[PDB]
Amino acid sequence: PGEFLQVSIQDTRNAVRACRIQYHHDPQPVGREKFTIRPHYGKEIPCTTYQQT
């Protein structure tokens, strides 16, 4: 989570070209608890994602 977003690449001259925008991005997970890392023991709840296909 952070108040901006920035992406960059490396050009042929080895310089750095970046753009920075203002984006909010305070994400929370599905269900009734605000956890950070998935556990080894838990329950399976439906959620949606962007498939890489």
Binding site: I37, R38, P39, H40
Partner: protein, 52 residues
């Protein structure tokens, strides 16, 4: 010296289950974390994992 690391000749690293291997997916990791001890009032913490 001689027997200072004689203890570690009889033991080997292992593989255990890590439920988040950096990308949000589970795996069988060679660096699975077992416990974190935070008893030093200094602010220092001690991690135990699977490798050596």
């Amino acid at each position: 010296v001689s027997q200072h690391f004689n203890v570690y000749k009889a033991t080997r690293p292992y593989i255990a289950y890590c439920a988040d291997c950096g990308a949000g997916h589970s795996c069988h990791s060679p660096v699975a974390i077992e416990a974190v001890r935070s008893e030093a009032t200094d602010g220092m913490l001690k991690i135990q994992f699977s490798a050596q």
